[PDB]
């Protein structure tokens, strides 16, 4: 028989929504998920899945379905995918080349980009090296470009590694906030629990 559902609403509707440099993660325990509810909804801008055919997601069983969440510049949203590179795919949140989860992204211009500018959402540049898959970089070490080490000093060739977005109420479909949620599946052995509605 049908029973409790998964907390998709808690992570989709939600409230003040995690920035990108520390992308929010949520583990979904034993539950039943209704993906068709998300599929049929037209509010979503892009619903692109790199694993199995979305149309029958409701007929496979997983164990450890993860949900990542963050916010991106509207134009630069096609970087949440394997291989792609950039400020959101190379330094902040890079999917593994072998990926088996869907990516969902929808516009939220009205909910953000206040008249005075949101200027709260932060994105990470200036990483000493690359980023391994599914790596969160919450540290705030001051970056340098060669020269001489700066021991917490701030100045030329020693920069803070985070920047604030420039959301404005009328920027365009390009520079508008987009909320992205990555539903990454998993079959890490052990009994499967996250099955279809049946």
């Amino acid at each position: 028989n049908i029973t409790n559902l998964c907390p998709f609403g808690e992570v989709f509707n939600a409230t003040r929504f995690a920035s990108v440099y520390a992308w929010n993660r949520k583990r979904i325990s034993n539950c039943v998920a209704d993906y068709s509810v998300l599929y049929n909804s037209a509010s979503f801008s892009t619903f692109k899945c790199y694993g199995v055919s979305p149309t029958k997601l409701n007929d496979l069983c997983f164990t450890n379905v993860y949900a990542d969440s963050f916010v991106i510049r509207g134009d630069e949203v096609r970087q949440i995918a394997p291989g792609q590179t950039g400020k959101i795919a190379d330094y902040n949140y890079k999917l593994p080349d072998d990926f088996t989860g869907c990516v969902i992204a929808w516009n939220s211009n009205n909910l953000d980009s206040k008249v005075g500018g949101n200027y709260n959402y932060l994105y990470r540049l200036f990483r000493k090296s690359n980023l391994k898959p599914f790596e969160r970089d919450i540290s705030t070490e001051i970056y340098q470009a060669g020269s001489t080490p700066c021991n917490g000093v701030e100045g030329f060739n020693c920069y803070f590694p985070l920047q604030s977005y420039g959301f404005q109420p009328t920027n365009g479909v390009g520079y508008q906030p987009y909320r992205v949620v990555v539903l990454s599946f998993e079959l890490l052995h052990a009994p499967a629990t996250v099955c279809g509605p049946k």
């Epitope: 630069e76 540049l125 420039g166």
Partner: antibody
Amino acid sequence: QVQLVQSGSELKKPGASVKISCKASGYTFINHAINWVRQAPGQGLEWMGWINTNTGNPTYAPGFTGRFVFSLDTSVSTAYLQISSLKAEDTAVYYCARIPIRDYDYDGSGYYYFLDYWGQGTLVTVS
Amino acid sequence: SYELTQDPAVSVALGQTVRITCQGDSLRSSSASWYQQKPGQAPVLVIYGKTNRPSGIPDRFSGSSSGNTASLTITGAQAEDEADYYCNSRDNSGNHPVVFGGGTKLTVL
């Protein structure tokens, strides 16, 4: 001790091609774009283009196709400029520049769109 | 979005504060940066961010921005600046991520 050094002066006849090399030392070369600029005697600098030192795909400024090719050797940390089908009105001094950002779209703030360190530059002359 | 006009005729007193002005219609919602270029030598920056001096020579160089105008300023020892000063800034319209102004030929008696 960041240091960018170009190749020496190059002489060639009109219509041929010129290869220009500039290499950078003292920092992680892979984490900085390489910008290009030209200057003619008595005339101000003009933007040429940039190379993302991760893939290489340039974004040439309008009208600079075919005559200019950008390349990079990461294993040696060097940048190369090819100027084929040269014209007498192309003699100039060329500089390659580093930028604190990997590319230009990375930083959407506009507070780092500047070139920090340059080299001596290469004089290309023909007749 | 195409050029940043300037004026290459700056020479005033050789012993007083000197100003360099740049006008650009695409400088309100953006930043600016200032270089110097001694004849032939490799040019290097003198101001980044319009306020933050560099480690090179942060002694007698200052910068300010007022609306569409960018202003560089020198204070003392005006000599040793027989040079050419150039500007940079972000740009819009998806045509040129950066552009360069005409440049100013700072000459001091």
